[PDB]
Design a protein around this ligand. Structure first.
Ligand SMILES: Nc1nc2c(ncn2[C@@H]2O[C@H](COP(=O)(O)CP(=O)(O)OP(=O)(O)O)[C@@H](O)[C@H]2O)c(=O)[nH]1
Ligand SMILES: Nc1nc2c(ncn2[C@@H]2O[C@H](COP(=O)(O)OP(=O)(O)OP(=O)(O)O)[C@@H](O)[C@H]2O)c(=O)[nH]1
Ligand SMILES: Nc1ncnc2c1ncn2[C@@H]1O[C@H](COP(=O)(O)OP(=O)(O)NP(=O)(O)O)[C@@H](O)[C@H]1O
Ligand SMILES: [Mg+2]
Ligand SMILES: [Mg+2]
Ligand SMILES: [Mg+2]
Lengths: 428, 426, 331
């Protein structure tokens, strides 16, 4: 009876979105035209005899992003009302994305979301794919978070946010968009994930043997995590941990709501014939810094809260041993304020990979999600990039000219300082 | 969506513009008759950005021809795709600036331009979602420069919310043109700076060298120089024609390329750029594109980057490239050549990716950017100008048209300010 | 030969009717001898933030008090022959337009005191001529416009600067000045908006050139004085004309950004001051570390509703106290 509505905003949100929907479609066997030859309603509402439709809205200002969607293989699946754009891009400028032109489609998105919400009986909440700094992926995100806070409030506000990497980037005003995106995000989100484009390429080339990975590879690893986290909304397990149970237990303080994550095992088809993929080895793999989806190093922080979501051929006894094994790893520092061990969920449904993909199918898998002081590292690097650009007022005239007060940047910076402080104090 | 209007400022704009349209027409599958006979819907999805749709499934170049030379008019009417181009856009007067910018701006240009603008208005009112204008002209020429400068100012007043993208031929250290080239250029630059958002400078000597040396076209004719220029213009317009892994636009470039309003000048180049025999000695991989893109000697400018600092670079790629492949090459370049990039920005390279290659290449890319090396342009104009001006050489050409010497003083000062900003960032 | 610091005054506005009706901290910020102290509650912590100015005027201090002190001192220096600039800063809604007119404010009290004294100087006379001329200009939609002309064609060029085709008027009497100011105001581009009532759609520039033959050694002094209602810092949505008032707001904010960058450049002693970039800052060329003595008039609200705006204003202005110049007597 649990239901979820998702938003795919900005080109990246849409591309991840499409990947997530291909996987959701795959997992249940829905055909490209909506036919199939239940829990399926969590993501794909029955609409009529012979057809189910995915509960999602794709949002941007670039007509191109949606035009691409409109020609895709699922164009027969999504109702046309689910694809919404404005006329002009944000020029990677928060001022445009949020205040001046983001306004073009606020009502349209609200119309579609409200219609989907009115069609739900057990809406757990919303799942949004967006950026931590990048045009409409910041802009609409800000506009839509204000509206979701007002229109729903109590419904879950869960998001996956694309993180600019220490080296991987596409533009130069990204730290301005990020400091503003984050400031706004902190006042509306219940829980969000940090997703690092650089780290994900490293996983693709080191774990999946992809010599030179691209966006179409990065999106697959992301969809594996999205699936595992939301799998419990629809599939039975030994330990039926609810998505909101999970968020509640993971966040000990209101300001610590941005967990880091990994997934294991991540293997190539060749590794599929060599790896000793036991419950314990997979669990152990989840705690190696090398496998994280964010370029942070946990040895420089403390684990505040963590949840291990096991999938497939996993026996709770194996898990108890696996957890006991992790408990002996003295190299893993846990926050001094949390005697509580791991929260564990175990889903009966095995993971799946996508045909034409990369990751090989396994009998057992674990999704690991955690809150740690170490994430401060990620935020600090964005602030260092920001301080240089801001101090020189480089390109500031574009923000100001497109609809922004220069002072907003200092408001955001102060809050980012608070953000770092929040992680430090809970670490201390 | 996001439509562009083009202006061909006299023969400069017409020779460059004509080649632009031959190339773009081929890119969109447009027949010499104007009808579409291409390969893919992608060629139609954005065709209206550059063409006017018509019965017969025709796509008419959305451009206005402007000059005071009726000989040019007839020459253009007689050329390729002339039968497609809308006859109403041949906006030619009958006189000529005579290499006198004031005559070409204050007097003859002043009369011509109101006719041109009535045409521009009718063309813009025929658009649904006009993003901007693109105009090609020279700085030191006569009618071309006069009308170019004049239209840019008047168009900017009428369309303050549109993009003004200017391509222009600028003064060379040796291969000069008019006897007052520095005067005309001084006057033009001053007026252009306050109206243009984005501009690309074209140095003919560089085009000649690239053709002579790079392409081994040791007889570097005007037709060959047009290949290089039209290829660049085509490169710049990729974002409004075909999609890919990293979608982009002109406004994104402005926001991420101009850190300070006066730093809007570009010194472009592209890759692969090879000869024919050389096709047996290459490997069209991103590292190859990268080496050519960041080759200081591969730019269409005398403003060699090794004597300046990059302020901001845009690397626009076309074809199904690996993003890790591209990202690592862009990072490797900045790390290796960090001594050539401004310390004001903790990332000096912007990346955009179209998955559709240009016709004939497995991979291609366009390299544009703003650099402090640009001050060499303004210093050349200023030195050539100040030397002639202090002798009041040809001064009667301008005072006879009502120009106060003050206009030149202000213009010279303006160029000194453009130089000063390049120096502050170096 | 040494440069000296520019001077600054900070004034608090009385609470608006809206501010009095709303529930907020009526006095989040308070003023001491020259200290401006504000209490802020953020991220569940309370801090005391503060800045110091040269002059200050709390909500309990009127224009008469300022007249006998702030205006008094400035006008004497203008009459001494110092080239002087009076400029200002604040967010929109702060009150500075109100105080320019006193709806009797700065343009009237400052000008009246100058001309009253000059009239007393005429009484002292009884070649001591008063070759006095004035002009009113405004920058509207980024176009300098002549408020003294008939039914924007103003070239800004070297003297310092001069404006091609600018109408200038001579002065024989204050009464004429009054009529001229009033006429200039009627021609001024202003507006009523969602929140504010005397929107300044332009940067309003008032210039007085006092060529006074204060001879003994025939000496003439030119007491140039520039009073400018620089537009304040805005938020279009905050007030909520499709595309005109938004454009003005943006152009204004860009103007202020630029002025800011110029101030910062002057503070950091850069090798080039980008005042040459914007026409506003070009018009301010000699105020920007030159021979013109300058003063900053800043205005803030006492209410907690404007803490972010207030602190941004006070920080800008306080930082600006690091600007120095070499004020001279125009002899
Ligand atoms: N790269 C190219 N440069 C050219 C071409 N044709 C001319 N030029 C260069 O431009 C300059 C001559 O300019 P134009 O014939 O365009 C002067 P225009 O006709 O615009 O005005 P008039 O003064 O009325 O002739 C000079 O530097 C030539 O060497 C061309 O096809 N390609
Ligand atoms: N993981 C992932 N990241 C992407 C993808 N496409 C773009 N990005 C990242 O997203 C950021 C750029 O933002 P975009 O989403 O392209 O921009 P946008 O939201 O469309 O905003 P505008 O184009 O400025 O209107 C960069 O950090 C890119 O690396 C993708 O398919 N997968
Ligand atoms: N000290 C004051 N006492 C009483 N009323 C005031 C005071 N200051 C401002 N106001 C009133 O508030 C309204 C004015 O806003 P002002 O006109 O003060 O805004 P402003 O800062 O000039 N806004 P803007 O012109 O948009 O940059 C006026 O009608 C004034 O009467
Ligand atoms: Mg986009
Ligand atoms: Mg010609
Ligand atoms: Mg006002």
């Amino acid at each position: 009876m649990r239901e979820c509505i998702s938003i795919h905003v900005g080109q990246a949100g849409v591309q991840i979105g499409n990947a997530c929907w291909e996987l959701y479609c795959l997992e249940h066997g829905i055909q490209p035209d909506g036919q199939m030859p239940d829990s399926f309603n969590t993501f794909f509402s029955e609409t009529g005899a012979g057809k189910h439709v995915p509960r999602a809205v794709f949002v941007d200002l670039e007509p191109t992003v949606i035009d691409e969607v409109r020609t895709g293989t699922y164009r027969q699946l999504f109702h046309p009302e689910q694809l919404i754009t404005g006329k002009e891009d944000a020029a990677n400028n928060y001022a445009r994305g949020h205040y001046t032109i983001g306004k073009e489609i606020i009502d349209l998105v609200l119309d579609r979301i409200r219609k989907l919400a009115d069609q739900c009986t057990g809406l757990q909440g919303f799942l949004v794919f967006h950026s931590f700094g990048g045009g409409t992926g910041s802009g609409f995100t800000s506009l839509l978070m204000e509206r979701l806070s007002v229109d729903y409030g109590k419904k879950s506000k869960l998001e996956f946010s694309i993180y600019p990497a220490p080296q991987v980037s596409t533009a130069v005003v990204e730290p301005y968009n990020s400091i503003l995106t984050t400031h706004t995000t902190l006042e509306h989100s219940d829980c969000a994930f940090m997703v690092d484009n650089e780290a994900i390429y490293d996983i693709c080339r080191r774990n999946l043997d992809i010599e030179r990975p691209t966006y179409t590879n990065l999106n697959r690893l992301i969809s594996q995590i999205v699936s595992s986290i939301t799998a419990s909304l629809r599939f039975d397990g030994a330990l039926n941990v609810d998505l909101t149970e999970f968020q509640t237990n993971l966040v000990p303080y209101p300001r610590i709501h941005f967990p880091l994550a990994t997934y294991a095992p991540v293997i190539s088809a060749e590794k599929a014939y060599h790896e000793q993929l036991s419950v314990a080895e997979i669990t152990n793999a989840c705690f190696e810094p090398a496998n994280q989806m964010v370029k942070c190093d946990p040895r420089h922080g403390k684990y505040m809260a963590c949840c291990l979501l096991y999938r497939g051929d996993v026996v709770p006894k194996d898990v108890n041993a696996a957890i006991a094994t992790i408990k002996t790893k003295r190299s893993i520092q846990f926050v001094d304020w949390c005697p509580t061990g791991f929260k564990v969920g175990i889903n009966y449904q095995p993971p799946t990979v996508v045909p034409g993909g990369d990751l090989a199918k396994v009998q057992r898998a674990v999704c690991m999600l955690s809150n740690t002081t170490a994430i401060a590292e990620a935020w600090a690097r964005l602030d260092h990039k920001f301080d240089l650009m801001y101090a020189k007022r480089a390109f500031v005239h574009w923000y100001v000219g497109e609809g922004m007060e220069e002072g907003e940047f200092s408001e955001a910076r102060e809050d980012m300082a608070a953000l770092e402080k929040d992680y430090e104090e809970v670490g201390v | 969506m996001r439509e562009i209007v083009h202006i061909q400022a006299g023969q400069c704009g017409n020779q460059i513009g004509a080649k632009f349209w031959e190339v773009i027409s081929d890119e969109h599958g447009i027949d010499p008759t104007g009808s579409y006979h291409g390969d893919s819907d992608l060629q139609l999805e954005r065709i209206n950005v550059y063409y006017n749709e018509a019965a017969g499934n025709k796509y008419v170049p959305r451009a206005i021809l402007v000059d005071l030379e009726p000989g040019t008019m007839d020459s253009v009417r007689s050329g390729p795709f002339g039968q497609i181009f809308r006859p109403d856009n041949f906006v030619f007067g009958q006189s000529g600036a005579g290499n006198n910018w004031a005559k070409g701006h204050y007097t003859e240009g002043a009369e011509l331009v109101d006719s041109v603008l009535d045409v521009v208005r009718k063309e813009s009112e025929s658009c649904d979602c006009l993003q901007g204008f693109q105009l090609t002209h020279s700085l030191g020429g006569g009618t071309g420069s006069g009308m170019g400068t004049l239209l840019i100012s008047k168009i900017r007043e009428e369309y303050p919310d549109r993009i003004m993208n200017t391509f222009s031929v600028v003064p060379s250290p040796k291969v000069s043109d008019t006897v007052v080239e520095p005067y005309n250029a001084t006057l033009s630059v001053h007026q252009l700076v306050e109206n243009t958002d984005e501009t690309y400078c074209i140095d003919n000597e560089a085009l000649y060298d690239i053709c002579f040396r790079t392409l081994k076209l040791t007889t570097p004719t005007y037709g060959d120089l047009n290949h290089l220029v039209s290829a660049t213009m085509s490169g710049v317009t990729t974002c409004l024609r075909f999609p890919g892994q990293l979608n982009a636009d002109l406004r994104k470039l402005a926001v991420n390329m101009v850190p300070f309003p006066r730093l809007h000048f570009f010194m472009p180049g592209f890759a692969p750029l090879t000869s024919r025999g050389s096709q047996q000695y290459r490997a069209l991989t991103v590292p190859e594109l990268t080496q050519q893109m960041f080759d200081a000697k591969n730019m269409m400018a005398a403003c060699d980057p090794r004597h300046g600092r990059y302020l901001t670079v845009a690397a626009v790629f076309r074809g199904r490239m690996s993003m890790k492949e591209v990202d690592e090459q862009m990072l490797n370049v900045q790390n290796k050549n960090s001594s050539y990039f401004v310390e004001w920005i903790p990332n000096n390279v912007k990346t955009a990716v179209c998955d559709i290659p240009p016709r004939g290449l497995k991979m291609s890319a366009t390299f544009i950017g703003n650099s402090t090396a640009i001050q060499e342009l303004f210093k050349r104009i200023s030195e050539q100008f100040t030397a002639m001006f202090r002798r009041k050489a040809f001064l009667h050409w301008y005072t006879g048209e009502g120009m106060d010497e003050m206009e030149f003083t202000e213009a010279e000062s303006n160029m000194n300010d453009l130089v000063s900003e390049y120096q502050q960032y170096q | 030969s040494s440069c000296v610091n520019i001077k600054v005054i900070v004034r608090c506005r009385p609470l608006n009717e809206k501010e009095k009706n709303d529930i907020n901290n009526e006095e989040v910020v308070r003023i001491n001898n020259n200290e401006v102290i504000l209490t802020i509650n953020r991220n569940n912590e309370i801090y005391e933030k503060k800045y110091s100015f040269d002059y200050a005027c709390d909500k309990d201090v009127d224009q008469k008090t300022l007249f006998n002190n702030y205006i008094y001192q400035i006008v004497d220096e203008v009459l001494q022959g110092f080239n002087c600039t009076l400029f200002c800063y604040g967010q929109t809604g702060t009150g500075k337009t109100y105080t320019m007119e006193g709806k009797t404010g700065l343009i009237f009290r400052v000008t009246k005191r100058i001309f009253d004294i000059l009239n007393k100087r005429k009484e002292e006379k009884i070649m001591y001529d008063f070759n006095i001329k004035i002009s009113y200009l405004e920058i509207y939609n980024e176009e300098l416009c002549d408020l003294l002309s008939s039914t924007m064609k103003l070239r800004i060029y070297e003297d310092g600067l001069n404006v091609d085709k600018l109408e200038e008027k001579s002065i024989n009497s204050f009464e004429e000045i009054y009529y001229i100011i009033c006429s200039a105001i009627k021609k001024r581009r202003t507006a009523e908006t969602a929140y504010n009532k005397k929107s300044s759609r332009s940067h309003s520039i008032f210039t007085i050139t006092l060529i006074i033959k204060d001879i003994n050694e025939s000496i003439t002094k030119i007491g140039k004085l520039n009073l400018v209602d620089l537009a304040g810092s805005e938020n279009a949505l905050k007030s909520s004309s499709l595309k005109i008032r938004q454009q003005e707001s943006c152009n204004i904010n860009q103007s202020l950004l630029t002025l800011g960058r110029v101030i910062n450049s002057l503070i950091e002693n850069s090798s080039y001051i980008p005042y040459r970039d914007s026409k506003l800052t070009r018009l301010l060329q000699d105020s920007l570390g030159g021979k013109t003595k300058t003063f900053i008039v800043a205005t803030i609200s006492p209410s907690s509703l404007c803490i972010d705006e207030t602190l941004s204003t006070l920080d800008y202005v306080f930082r600006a106290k690091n600007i120095k110049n070499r004020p001279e007597i125009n002899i």
